[PDB]
Each structure stands twice: as C-alpha cells, then as structure tokens.
C-alpha cells in the first residue's frame, strides 16, 4: 500500500473538515507507516498495510494513556482515522516533538559532559516508564515471550521444511529447544516498556545538548523491560556497550549479566527474525541474508 498526497488529504479533511492543511510533506518512512508532516505542527501516520494498522491503534491508545506521565515529552494524541476494512486504525495525527535523532556519531561528538547526562536522563526515563502501573492495559498489550518464541519456531518448519535438508534443520531444534529451556529468558517481571527504543527514536535539542523527547511507541507492549536496554547496545548502529553500561549504573539495575547474556540470544535470533519478517514484509534480501547465517 502507498499513498499520494491527494489522497492523504482526503482522508484528514473527511473526518476532520474545519481544519485545513497548508504545507503537508513526507517526513519519514518505516516498515509499517509513512509518516506525513502537516502544518509543521503535527505528524500523521498512514499504516501501509494490516499489521501496521495494528500498531498504530496500539500506540494511540497507549499514549493517550502514559500522556503526561514522563520525565521526557512523548508524542500527544490530536487526531484519529476510523477502522475499515482490514485496517483497524485508518491513520493518526501526534504533535511534533522540536529536535534531532540523537544518532551515535552526534552522542561521540558531545561533551563527555553532556554524554553522561544523557545517560542519566534516558536511565530516568526507562526507570519511570517500566514503573507504570500495568493493571489497567488489555491482556492482548501483554506479550508472552515463550508463546512468541514457539510460535517462531513453528512459521520457520513451514517456511524452511522445502529450503534445508534433514542434518540442517536439526540445528534449527537444537536452538530452539536451547532458548526454550532457559528460564532465563522468561522468569522477569513483565512491564510496559518501549520495545524499539534506539538512538532513531531518541529526540535531542542542538542548542541545549539535552535529549528533548522519545517518539514511537508502536511497538510497545508488557514484556521484559532488559529489552529497551539491549536495543541501544549493537556496536555498530546502536550506542556502545560501554555508553549502555552507564545507563544501566543510573537505572540501578541488579543483573547486569543477565542482560548481555539476553543480548547474546538476541542478536543470534534475530537471524530467523529475518526470515520471518522477511517472508511477510516481503524483503526477498532479508529472506536471503537470514538463510546462510542460519547455514552456520
Ligand atoms: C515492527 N518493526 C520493527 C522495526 O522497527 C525494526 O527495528 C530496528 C531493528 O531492526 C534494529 O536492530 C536489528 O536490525 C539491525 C539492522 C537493520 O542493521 C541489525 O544490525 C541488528 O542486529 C538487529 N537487532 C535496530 N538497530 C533499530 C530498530 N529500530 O526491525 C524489527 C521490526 C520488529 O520489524
């Protein structure tokens, strides 16, 4: 699914008709949304496809209900689309948040200062955030780590029984039942957490040299709150292992081991992640790659 600017502005018009557009322009596209920058005041998200549809409904609800709670600012909820069809939301209009994506390159060119500042700041954002109450979100906000894992393994038998020959799929089991009988991976204590919290979704305020907000919470969900950690440790994309050291000194957290031992599964999992989103994305070079890192 895409769209043209025409029809964008159809759709906002329609359910919102004393408002008008004056400057509208693309200010960024994902996996599951085209982001639209309408008036400069607001950015509107257009789902580009059912399970995109899906998140965006999430993170509606889940701003709207986590709105003024934050130490940092977090995206405010103005305007909202209809179900339809197979989309459940049929787009979303959040206040723009002033700034830039705090990327790796920007946070090294700080002041060691201001970089451990950051640290401080993100700990106590993390830290507030997996303290909010989750008894009031729908149970289907809560993702079962062990369900998610087993259904994997299903989708991969079916996507890989006509790819691999007996001896290589043996390997696939091994991993499997590796992750599956590990407690250690599924014995935390659920929480609301991001879940796609990395340096491109960490705002930052050139003229202060301050993180000035966070910003896409279509992922978020009750899960392991040692995953909004791990996100910012990949070396290359992401932040250090050495700067993730610091927040993690902030946030006051007890196992630090724990988390580069779930650190180390992940970034082997995310292999067959490939493979999966890969096939239904469909990203056929995904879908490759994922394939002969798995021959290994
Ligand atoms: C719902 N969509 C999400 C989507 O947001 C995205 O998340 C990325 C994640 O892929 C990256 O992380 C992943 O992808 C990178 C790759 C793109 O270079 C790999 O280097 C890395 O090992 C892997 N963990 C991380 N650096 C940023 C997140 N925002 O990819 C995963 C996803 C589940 O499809």
Not at 229 to 250: P, R, T
Not at 272 to 279: D, L, N, S, V
Request: net charge negative; aromatic share 12%.
């Amino acid at each position: 699914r895409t769209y043209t600017f025409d029809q964008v502005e159809k759709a906002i018009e329609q359910l919102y008709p004393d408002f008008t557009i004056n400057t509208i322009q693309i200010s960024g596209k994902g996996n599951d949304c085209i982001a639209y920058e309408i008036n400069r005041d607001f950015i509107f998200k257009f789902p580009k496809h059912s399970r995109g549809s899906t998140n965006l409904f999430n993170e509606v609800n889940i701003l709207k209900r986590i709105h003024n709670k934050l130490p940092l600012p977090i995206p405010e909820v103005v305007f909202t689309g209809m179900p339809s069809e197979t989309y459940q939301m049929s787009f979303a209009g959040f206040t723009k948040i002033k700034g830039v994506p705090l990327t790796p390159l920007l946070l090294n060119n700080l002041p060691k200062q201001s970089q451990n500042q950051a640290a401080k700041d993100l700990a106590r954002f993390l830290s507030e955030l997996h303290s909010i109450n989750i008894s009031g979100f729908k149970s289907n906000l809560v993702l079962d780590f062990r369900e998610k894992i087993n259904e994997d393994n299903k989708k991969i038998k079916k996507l890989l029984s006509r790819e691999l020959k007996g001896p290589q799929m043996k390997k696939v089991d091994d991993f499997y039942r590796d992750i599956l009988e590990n407690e250690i991976y599924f014995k935390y204590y659920p929480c609301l957490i991001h879940n796609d919290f990395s340096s491109d979704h960490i705002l930052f305020d050139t003229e202060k040299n301050t993180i000035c907000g966070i910003i896409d919470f279509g992922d978020a969900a009750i899960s392991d709150p040692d995953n909004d950690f791990i996100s910012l440790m990949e070396d290359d994309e992401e932040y250090g292992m050495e700067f993730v050291s610091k927040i993690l000194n902030h946030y006051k957290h007890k196992d630090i081991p724990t988390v580069l031992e779930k650190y180390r599964m992940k970034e082997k999992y995310w292999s067959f992640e490939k493979i999966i989103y890969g096939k239904e994305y469909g990203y056929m070079d995904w879908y490759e790659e994922g394939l002969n890192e798995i021959r290994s």
